[PDB]
């Protein structure tokens, strides 16, 4: 299968899913990065993995849905047959999302369906939860709430800050985020016609 990440920022697990790609056994490959801002960390990573890049400003659009048909254009030219966000930090319109059905997967560093957000480590230590974790989901129209591939639980620790907990959930996302990619790129899990998860 032929990957396309999306990314907003440093791109945390983008590494992490390249590795995964080039390792022997693998059902797929990262062909292109896209950003949504200019000089973001993220694609100094891709640059530096040989992958090829594009920035599409989301601030050169009038709506959602003329931002989201520029990404799709490109993910056409690319022949991507799946879509990874990593970071990516634009909520998608609903065509866009129902195009790419089943064939997009989210990173999100909380045990959905807690703590839906952008903000999941802050409300996450404002709750007290002593157990935390990361999501990885098939993107629906509804924010994080997409099927449920894998999850990992991970320790909230006493005096944990947003800068301590977010880096023990990264490690985590690390390892179920590639897990989860190969995953749905084999023939392995599918978004079923009834629209839950299915193990072939």
Not at 32 to 49: H, M, P, Y
Not at 80 to 106: E, T
């Amino acid at each position: 299968a032929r990957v396309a990440v999306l990314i907003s920022g440093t791109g945390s697990n983008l590494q992490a899913l390249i590795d995964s790609t080039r390792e022997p056994n693998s059902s797929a490959q990262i062909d292109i990065v896209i950003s949504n801002k200019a000089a973001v960390a993220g694609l100094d990573k891709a640059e530096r993995a040989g992958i090829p890049t594009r920035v599409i400003n989301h601030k050169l659009y009038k709506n959602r849905v003329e931002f989201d048909s520029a990404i799709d254009l490109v993910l056409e030219e690319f022949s991507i047959d799946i879509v990874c966000l990593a970071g990516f930090m634009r909520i998608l319109s609903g065509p866009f999302v129902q195009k790419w059905n089943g064939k997009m997967l989210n990173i999100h560093p909380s045990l959905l369906p807690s703590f839906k957000g952008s903000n999941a480590h802050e409300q996450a230590l404002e709750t007290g939860v002593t157990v935390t974790g990361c999501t990885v989901h098939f993107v629906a129209e509804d924010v994080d709430a997409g099927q449920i591939i894998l999850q990992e639980a991970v320790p909230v620790k006493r005096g944990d800050t947003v800068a301590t907990l977010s880096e023990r959930v990264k490690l985590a996302e690390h390892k179920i985020f590639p897990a989860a990619l190969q995953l749905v790129a084999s023939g392995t899990v599918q978004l079923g016609e009834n629209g839950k998860i299915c193990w072939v």
